Structures are given as C-alpha cells and as structure tokens.
Write an enzyme that holds these catalytic residues in place. Sequence first.
Site, PDB file in Angstrom:
ATOM      1  N   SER A 192       0.700   2.676   9.782  1.00 52.60           N
ATOM      2  CA  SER A 192       1.896   1.756  10.672  1.00 52.60           C
ATOM      3  C   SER A 192       2.101  -0.103   9.950  1.00 52.60           C
ATOM      4  O   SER A 192       1.227  -0.132   9.564  1.00 52.60           O
ATOM      5  CB  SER A 192       1.310   1.605  11.890  1.00 52.60           C
ATOM      6  OG  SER A 192       1.977   2.509  13.008  1.00 52.60           O
ATOM      7  N   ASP A 218      -0.075  -7.581   1.095  1.00 52.15           N
ATOM      8  CA  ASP A 218       0.089  -5.967   1.635  1.00 52.15           C
ATOM      9  C   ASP A 218       1.535  -5.651   1.750  1.00 52.15           C
ATOM     10  O   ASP A 218       1.877  -5.557   2.241  1.00 52.15           O
ATOM     11  CB  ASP A 218      -0.828  -5.466   2.911  1.00 52.15           C
ATOM     12  CG  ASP A 218      -0.075  -3.548   2.606  1.00 52.15           C
ATOM     13  OD1 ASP A 218      -0.205  -3.291   1.736  1.00 52.15           O
ATOM     14  OD2 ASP A 218       0.317  -3.372   3.779  1.00 52.15           O
ATOM     15  N   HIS A 269       0.693  -1.009  -0.334  1.00 52.75           N
ATOM     16  CA  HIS A 269      -0.135   0.084   0.251  1.00 52.75           C
ATOM     17  C   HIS A 269       0.742   0.882   0.428  1.00 52.75           C
ATOM     18  O   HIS A 269       0.075   2.270   0.197  1.00 52.75           O
ATOM     19  CB  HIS A 269      -0.647  -0.252   1.552  1.00 52.75           C
ATOM     20  CG  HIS A 269      -0.401   0.735   2.419  1.00 52.75           C
ATOM     21  ND1 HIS A 269      -0.065  -0.495   3.288  1.00 52.75           N
ATOM     22  CD2 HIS A 269       0.235   1.772   3.737  1.00 52.75           C
ATOM     23  CE1 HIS A 269       0.832  -0.027   4.412  1.00 52.75           C
ATOM     24  NE2 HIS A 269       0.652   0.885   3.737  1.00 52.75           N
TER      25      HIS A 269
HETATM   26  P1  LIG Z   1       2.064   2.166  14.475  1.00 54.97           P
HETATM   27  O1  LIG Z   1       1.383   0.634  14.776  1.00 54.97           O
HETATM   28  O2  LIG Z   1       2.033   3.298  15.458  1.00 54.97           O
HETATM   29  C1  LIG Z   1       2.659   5.103  15.117  1.00 54.97           C
HETATM   30  C2  LIG Z   1       1.164   5.231  14.091  1.00 54.97           C
HETATM   31  C3  LIG Z   1       2.719   5.180  16.127  1.00 54.97           C
HETATM   32  O3  LIG Z   1       3.819   1.741  14.597  1.00 54.97           O
HETATM   33  C4  LIG Z   1       4.671   2.045  13.758  1.00 54.97           C
HETATM   34  C5  LIG Z   1       5.900   2.142  15.317  1.00 54.97           C
HETATM   35  C6  LIG Z   1       5.767   0.696  13.070  1.00 54.97           C
END
Ligand SMILES: *P(=O)(OC(C)C)OC(C)C
Lengths: 191, 191, 191
Positions: free
Chosen positions: C146, C79, C49
């Site tokens: 993330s 993904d 993505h």
């Molecule tokens: P993500 O699920 O969270 C950020 C939006 C803080 O985690 C990353 C660091 C892989």
Amino acid sequence: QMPSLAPMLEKVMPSVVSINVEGSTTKFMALGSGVIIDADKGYVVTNNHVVDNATVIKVQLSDGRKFDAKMVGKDPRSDIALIQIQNPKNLTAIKMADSDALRVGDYTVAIGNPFGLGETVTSGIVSALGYENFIQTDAAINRGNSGGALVNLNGELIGINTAIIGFAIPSNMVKNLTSQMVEYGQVKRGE
Amino acid sequence: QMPSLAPMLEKVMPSVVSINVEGSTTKFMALGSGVIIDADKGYVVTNNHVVDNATVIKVQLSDGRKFDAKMVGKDPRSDIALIQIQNPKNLTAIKMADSDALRVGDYTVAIGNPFGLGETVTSGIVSALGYENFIQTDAAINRGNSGGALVNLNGELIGINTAIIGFAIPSNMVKNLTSQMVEYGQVKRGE
Amino acid sequence: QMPSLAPMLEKVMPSVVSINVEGSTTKFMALGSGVIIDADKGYVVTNNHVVDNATVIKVQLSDGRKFDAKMVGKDPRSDIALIQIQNPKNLTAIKMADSDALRVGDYTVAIGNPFGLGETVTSGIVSALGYENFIQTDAAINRGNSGGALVNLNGELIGINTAIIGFAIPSNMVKNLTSQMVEYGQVKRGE
Ligand SMILES: *P(=O)(OC(C)C)OC(C)C
Ligand SMILES: *P(=O)(OC(C)C)OC(C)C
Ligand SMILES: *P(=O)(OC(C)C)OC(C)C
C-alpha cells in the site's frame, strides 16, 4: 442529535438472522450470519462455508425467535448458500439493491455473527468493483469468520460478504444464484 | 470547510494525558494513555496493564506540562486503574456519557499513545454492545498497545479501550469502578 | 441521494496512474500506483520501492491509455521517486494541498494498486501529524503493498503513502523532494 447509522440499522436488523449448524464430515459445529431474502417462503441467504456438511441448521431472529431450517441450495464457487426456515412466521426480508449502480467511494456497512454473541456491525466504503469476487470494501476485514450482509446507507443489501480488505458477492449476483437454487436445487454454470 | 473531527478533538485532547511508567517485577518501562476524570483531585483513569508493578508514574498533558502521579486503585479484571496527579494545576476533566444510551451504529473515536510519540486518533462505530467486555468497536483495532479513551461525536467519554475489532469498558462501568477505588482503594465484587 | 466520496473520486482518479515495473538486481516484476504531479512534463510521483532497480517502467491511466516512463529521481530515505511519462498527451495533474494545514481529526482517502487489478480506495482520518514519516492515518493499513496517494475530501493530495496504521510523506515534503529531483537528479540533504 449526532449522525448515526443506528436509525437505518434498526430497520435492517430484522432481516438479519444468525445461523447455528451441527453437521459432520467423518461432530462439527459451525455458526454464522444470514439474511432473510424471502419472507413468505422463509428464504435465508448465507455463506456456503457455514452450512456445508450440515445435519442440523438452526436460525435465530434478531428478536430472539428460533427456527429450524433446511438446505435448498449451495454453491462452493461463490460461498453462497440458500436455506429455508421451517414454519416461518412474521418475517422481514431485506430489500436488495442494484449492484450495477455501485460506485467505489460509496459507504457500506457489514453485519455479521463473528463470535456467536450476536450481531456485529462495521462500516467502510466500496474499495473496488468491476483475483475474483465482484465487490471489495474496507468496511469488512478479510475474515474467514466474517460473512454476513453488505448493506448501503439506505439499509439495502448490496452484497454478501465472504472469505477467500474484504470481498463480497454483489447482490445482483446473489439474486441470480439463489433463485437459480430455488428452481434447480443448484446453480447451473453457462456456456 | 470540509467536515472534520478536529473541532471536537480540540476540546477533548486537554483531558487526555500520556502515561510513562517505570516499575519492576524481578527494570521495566511501560507507557500508555489516560483520561483526566477529576480535575480538582487530578484523578486520571487508565489501563491496569500499564501502571501494574509501577515504581514511578509520570504524566504529561497535551500542552506538554509534566506531573508525577501515584496509584490510588486498580482492577486486573477490567484492565482499569486509577492514578492521581501530584500537585495538579489547571486541569481539564473529560465529561462522561451515559453508556446505557449507546447504540451500535454509533460513531466513536479512540485516542491513545501507541508509540510514545504523542496522541493517535482513530475512528469507527459501535460494533457490538450488550467473551466479555461491554463495548466493541471497529474504531480501535484489538491492540495490546491500544488502550486510551473511547469518545463519541460530542467529545464525551463512552468508554476506555483495553486489550483481551476492539473492546472497551463502558463509561458507566468505568465510573462505578474508579469511584469504588477512591473510597475503598479497591473494587469490591458483589454477591 | 446518499453521501458518497464517488463524486470527488471521479475528479481525482484521472491523476492516479498504475505502475508496472520490469527491472532486475542479479528478472523481477514489481507493480504499484502513482500520481501525475505535472501534466505538461508528465511527472508522476511514486514509491521508490516500486521503481527501484527498474529496466522498464510502464504507466497506465485510469482511462486505460498506456505509456512508457523513465526515471528522473528517487530517494530511498522517504520511499519517494519521480518518473516521467514518454510522449505524454492529455494528462491530468492532481492539485497538492498545504500539508501544514493538516489536523488530526481530518478525513483522508487512500488510493492504490494493491493487486494489479486496478485502483482500490480506502478511507480514514489523520491519526497523527507532527519513529518517523510526517503523516499517520487509519485510512490506509500499514502495507508493503500500500503506497499511492493520500487525499483529502476536496480531492487534493495531502501525502504519498509508504511502507516502513499507516504513514505518508506529506505533500509539502513531496513537493520539496520531487522538485529537488527534477533540478538535481537527486535530493541533496542539508547541513
Ligand atoms: P492499503 O493500505 O490497503 C490495501 C492492501 C487494501 O491502501 C491502499 C488503497 C493505498
Ligand atoms: P468482519 O470482516 O469482522 C469481524 C471479525 C469484526 O465483518 C463482519 C461484521 C461482517
Ligand atoms: P489502537 O487500537 O490502534 C493503534 C495501534 C493505531 O487505537 C488507539 C488510537 C486507541
């Protein structure tokens, strides 16, 4: 027996106070958390978004003792403000750590007053260091109600949590700001 | 080699069951998590919001064995209910811990059935102790789907997670409630 | 002095790169995180993505060195995509771990580029193992921003985080997929 943060928190909590504001802006009652940064002077550091437009500021220690407080300085920029306890007696100040020594994988603990029911402790690690606001951590969710202290495993203040994962003004930044308030009643930006 | 909760969870999981309800209220199919609190009687403690208005209650052990269950007690107040397994065989009951011994910085683990795909484990610490609901922790997000057990590092039950950070009815509270259901078929409030 | 993930992260970060895409689909600029999976070939694994519909792919190492990259394979299904660095020099590849050896109570760390300001690290544990997507953990919130690596305490890749608590394609799954892209330019489903 089992590992726990309880021991260190038992040392830190005495430095963490809870703020109860009663101001206005044409009533209005806000509430927050703070950290005693100077025991003799009764200097308590906190979020500007809590003491802004305050008519009456009240502080309560973790032991239950209540005090009055007055504004000494504030800075909308970083959401950092400084209040001073009226007639302070037997206070404990938190020990500040060198922010510059912070590394990402580091464990942090956030202390606050999210509901006015007392102190709430959460844990995490330093997510990001060097958008804005020097420190980022998963130890404190990005809440407009979550401010308070950002502490390391040794129970030292590494930053103050604020609202825009979470962001905190690092302790060195906080030292520089607040002390600047004491002397100038405000923080003078550079050039 | 590396630190892990896997060892202790391997001891606890046998006490954690998954609930599948099929009731009504003028169908309706809910699903949740539970904890075997009494192995001989087959007493499983769970959230009231899962077994409420149930016509059929089904339980499945972490080993995959399925059982039928009947209501013995419930309490909308705390979201705590008690069901009993039909023809229970070779069951393992969780050991309850003394809630009163809980401290904030304490590490906790939450076990549940958020999607019906099996058990989900999350970790955190005791955020707040002594709004309502005795225990608060970051180890379980405030989800209307997140109930289940709240366990300490020794794999002992310190509370039951419920929906209103997370809130859990402390184990001592749970003991008092459920046992009160066994004897009275319901919990009698005081005066 | 105090326990920290900093040491191990200092070993892992060199394998984590940041992706900057500039494609289209009738401009459009996406950005993400990636992991160097093959140092000699400069094979970087990432989320589909992020590189989907890309015209230009740019990679920047944690040391600040920038490189160009080209698509070699992708798979909307999981993904997972694979890009290759142009003229790769002095690269470090992450060591993959055996997903099958994963247990729930296990500690994990997620690394990513959520704002384009650099790398962000978060911690948690394996929530669920064996809806879809093999690995589930509280170490990475379910964010469409993330992605990135899912690493264990030994700093080994156990999975790649993706968007649908969090879900990650386990490393063994990732190995099988990507290598399948190298040889076939795409992943051929079975029968
Ligand atoms: P993500 O699920 O969270 C950020 C939006 C803080 O985690 C990353 C660091 C892989
Ligand atoms: P906050 O980000 O979270 C509360 C709303 C639980 O953290 C406080 C404890 C500083
Ligand atoms: P819940 O608060 O969270 C799930 C929705 C991931 O915790 C359960 C595991 C009790």
